[PDB]
């Protein structure tokens, strides 16, 4: 039952830098450790195994060592399409332990998201539902808190977000989060408000307005 | 060329079972040992199962112990993956991967992976019904329909059990939506209507959920 | 590539009675041919194979001959528990084909179905469903057919029906159909009707209610 | 007592897949030739899979043939039914029946079976997607969308006034509700300038469902 723990959790690079990922061991594990490339939604790429052995076909820029109980990925001369997460893997006869995995971004500076509130269309309520939107819209870096209050009572297992990949153009993300009320949930309160809480912002923003206008 | 795709990923509620296979093409099974791997949300790596050549050994995650069970079929190259007694945090991208290398050893690693497919356990393993009136209007028909519960079963009593004459419960029907309905009726006098009450009691035991609903005239 | 016809298709009889249910095939299976019986909701029960040959634990009351492509299973003596679905099957070593069944249910005299429609309720049109109910009451034989109009507008595919087994005191069934729609195709349309067709009707029967009256 | 017990019926879409399974107690599967059986709607059972001893043979109701597959587990007891690329016409009771008898022979009856679990087919393969506007109500730049709830399966495209308008958008990806549809939502930051003047149409397309739809959004 060998504890795998990587590090750093989140690696932030730019174009043509040379980073290395820590894999450490909770007890030695020899050689038996393999390395892997994913990209999101799309399934993970064996890189390397036995600690050092490049994987027929895999670019000689990834390269693998150590040994023990610590062990180093490094890419030298980071490539656009490298930008993914990497896992770790010890990896015995008949079973196998990750780490927590390392998500490897393109840096850039902190920018403060712009936050927008959406409340529900009419034609929606009129059918039985109301869905709140609350967009959080370029931001850097990717950890932020979104919280929902209805009438000042903190909401929880009745909103769903999605985070967009990193941008093309300006290396931020967007998020969007939904809250879903049944019609009379939604008719039996009025001020309806979001917080975001984020590095690149002094203090949260909270987005809020009232039913009905 | 290889390839590995899995099936029967879904939306299944807590304390459910599902089943998930994995076919290949462009090789054999038989010579490999067949691992299930899944990815949480947080986007970590978690290793599920593995199951051994001619199925001598079968290992799985504690996490998992207990509730799944992993089959091979090397005769039609397919692996299948048995949960049962789910849980919400087994909610993850599941991949079937293979065990290999361009020459097999006792120990390689994952070298080809299923594209996954998408298993979400929904936190609620119950819902209590909404009870809503089938309102009459000399042999009068009136009643409850049971709407929107789950799992079966519910019980239905007319003024705490003491009409008992006339009364018909149907059998459940499952709905498109995956929660159950069913309605409870009763034939009574024509002029009872206004003059003596008519409650319905709902007892749904899964959820510990009563229910009384008086059906008057409108 | 054997089919199997089974006969009569509804077989209605008296506690007491002798009944004999016949299954032909459509060419020679020797005596490869099984019994079971089947109570709704039940398990298949095997009560003979070998075409006469009884399983262990079946009461003596049922029997089983033919040969070739005639086969008979007999019922001496009518219980209440013999009341269920009969199924002829043959099996062959690696595969099997099953006759369409034959429903054994207790003979009354007909009687037409009480009918009667319900709205949806208010509560439930707020909550954006709106579920209308016809039930047949007290009614014999079980075939039946009902129809949903809107607006003279027959439906399909937005029904579903439930119906009870034969009842323990008078012998009859009753039967529950469930149109769903959303709020907007209920209120989008003023007349709702259901239209049974049964054995003891001299006619079809229609009941209909006009929506908010 | 000799028992079977079947896991995984549910809901499932048309053209969709789910899987069966089956475990025994009291008795180990390896000697019997194991078999899967429905009872449709009308009432009938309908023999719909057989696979032998060993695998050796596998055998199907023709109406099935290329769309099911039956496999064994021997070791731990378990018998497995795939069904792919399923039709309103599979949806039924099924049950997993043990061949056998007192003393085995070459060709035995189906001496035990499980209490069958339900397995049901909806009609309907696809749904197509509701649209519902993300009207603007800071600064230089206003915000706006559409909400696309309610559609299955993926994928679905969103476009802006044609295709004219993309510098700005942000199509996010899908998410799975726990009703079993998906939903998304699609935005544009604008100057604040333009509402009023300019008007703005999402144009989505579930190609899954030949379904489009053209929105126009607009304040308040």
């Known amino acids: 039952a060998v504890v795998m723990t990587q590090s750093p959790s989140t690696l932030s690079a730019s174009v043509g830098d040379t980073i290395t990922i820590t894999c450490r061991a909770s007890?030695?594990?020899?050689?038996?450790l393999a390395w892997y490339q994913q990209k999101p939604g799309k399934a993970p790429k064996l890189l390397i195994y036995?600690?050092?052995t490049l994987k027929t076909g895999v670019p000689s820029r990834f390269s693998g060592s150590g040994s023990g109980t610590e062990f180093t990925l490094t890419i030298s001369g980071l490539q656009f399409d490298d930008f993914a997460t990497y896992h770790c893997?010890?990896?015995?006869?008949?079973?196998?332990?990750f780490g927590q995995g390392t998500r490897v971004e393109i840096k850039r500076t902190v920018a403060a998201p712009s936050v927008f509130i959406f409340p529900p269309s009419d034609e929606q309520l009129k059918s039985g539902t109301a869905s709140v939107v609350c967009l959080l819209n370029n931001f850097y870096p990717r950890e932020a808190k979104v919280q929902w209050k209805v009438d000042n009572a903190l909401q929880s297992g009745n909103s769903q977000e999605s985070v967009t990949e990193q941008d093309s153009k300006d290396s931020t993300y967007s998020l969007s989060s939904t809250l879903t009320l049944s019609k009379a949930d939604y008719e039996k309160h009025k001020v309806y408000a979001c917080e975001v809480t984020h590095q690149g912002l002094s203090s949260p923003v909270t987005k809020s307005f009232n039913r009905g206008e | 060329e290889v390839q590995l795709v899995e099936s029967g990923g879904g939306l299944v509620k807590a304390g459910g079972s599902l089943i998930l296979s994995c076919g290949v093409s462009n090789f054999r099974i038989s010579a490999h040992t067949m691992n299930w791997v899944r990815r949480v949300p947080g986007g970590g790596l978690e290793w599920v199962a593995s199951?051994?050549?001619?199925?001598?050994?079968?290992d799985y995650a504690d996490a998992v112990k207990g509730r799944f069970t992993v089959s091979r079929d090397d005769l039609e190259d397919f692996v299948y993956l048995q949960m049962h007694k789910m849980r919400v945090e087994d909610t993850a991208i599941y991949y079937c991967?293979?065990?290999?290398?361009?020459?097999?050893?006792?120990?390689?690693?994952?070298?080809?992976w299923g594209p996954g497919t998408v298993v979400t356990v929904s936190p609620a393993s119950t819902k209590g019904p909404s009870v809503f009136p089938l309102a009459p209007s000399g042999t009068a028909a009136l009643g409850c329909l049971v709407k929107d519960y789950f799992p079966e079963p519910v019980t239905v009593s007319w003024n705490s059990g003491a009409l008992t004459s006339g009364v018909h419960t149907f059998p459940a029907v499952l709905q498109s939506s995956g929660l159950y309905s069913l309605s409870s009726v009763v034939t009574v006098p024509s002029s009872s209507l206004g003059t003596q009450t008519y409650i319905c009691n709902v007892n749904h035991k899964p959820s510990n959920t009563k229910v009384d609903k008086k059906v008057e005239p409108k | 590539a054997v089919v199997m016809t089974q006969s009569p298709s509804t077989l209605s009889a008296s506690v007491g009675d002798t009944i004999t249910i016949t299954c032909?095939?459509?060419?020679?299976?020797?005596?490869?041919?099984?019994?079971y019986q089947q109570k709704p909701g039940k398990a298949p029960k095997l009560?003979?194979?070998?075409?006469?040959?009884?399983?262990t634990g079946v009461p003596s009351r049922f029997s089983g001959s033919g040969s070739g492509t005639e086969f008979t299973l007999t019922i001496s003596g009518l219980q209440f528990d013999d009341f269920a679905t009969?199924?002829?099957?043959?099996?062959?070593?690696?595969?099997?084909?099953?006759?369409?069944g034959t429903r054994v249910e207790i003979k009354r005299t007909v009687a037409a179905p009480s009918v009667f429609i319900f709205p949806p309720s208010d509560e439930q049109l707020k909550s954006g469903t709106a579920s209308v109910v016809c039930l047949l009451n007290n009614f014999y034989p079980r075939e039946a057919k009902v129809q949903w109009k809107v607006d003279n507008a027959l439906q399909s595919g937005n029904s579903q029906e439930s119906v009870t087994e034969q009842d323990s005191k008078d012998s009859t069934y009753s039967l529950s159909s469930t149109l769903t729609l959303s709020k907007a195709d209920y209120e989008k349309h003023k007349v709702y009707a259901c239209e049974v067709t049964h054995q003891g009707l001299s006619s079809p029967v229609t009941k209909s209610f006009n929506r908010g009256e | 007592e000799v028992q079977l017990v079947e896991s995984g019926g549910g809901l499932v879409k048309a053209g969709g897949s789910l899987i069966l399974s089956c475990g025994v107690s009291n008795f180990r599967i390896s000697a019997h030739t194991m078999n899967w059986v429905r009872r449709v709607p009308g009432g009938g059972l309908e023999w719909?899979?057989?696979?032998?001893?060993?695998?050796?043979?596998?055998?199907?109701?023709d109406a099935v043939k290329g769309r099911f597959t039956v496999s064994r587990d021997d070791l731990e007891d378990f018998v497995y039914l795939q069904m792919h690329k399923m039709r309103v016409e599979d949806t039924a009771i099924?049950?997993?029946?043990?061949?056998?008898?007192?003393?085995?022979?070459?060709?035995?009856?189906?001496?035990?079976?499980?209490?069958g679990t339900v397995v049901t087919v909806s009609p309907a393969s696809t749904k197509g997607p509701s649209v519902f506007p993300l009207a603007p109500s800071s600064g230089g730049t206003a915000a706006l969308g559409c909400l696309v709830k309610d559609y299955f399966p993926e994928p679905v495209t969103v476009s802006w006034n044609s295709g004219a308008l993309t510098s700005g958008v942000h199509t996010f990806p899908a998410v799975l509700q726990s009703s079993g549809l998906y939903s998304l939502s699609s935005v544009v930051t604008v100057p604040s300038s333009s509402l009023g003047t300019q008007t703005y149409i999402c144009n989505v397309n579930h190609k899954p469902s030949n379904t489009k739809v053209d929105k126009k959004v607009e304040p308040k």
């Open positions: 199951i051994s050549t001619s199925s001598t050994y079968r």
């Open positions: 893997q010890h990896y015995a006869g008949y079973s196998a332990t």
């Open positions: 007890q030695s594990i020899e050689t038996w």
């Open positions: 036995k600690a050092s």
């Open positions: 991967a293979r065990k290999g290398s361009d020459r097999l050893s006792d120990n390689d690693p994952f070298d080809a």
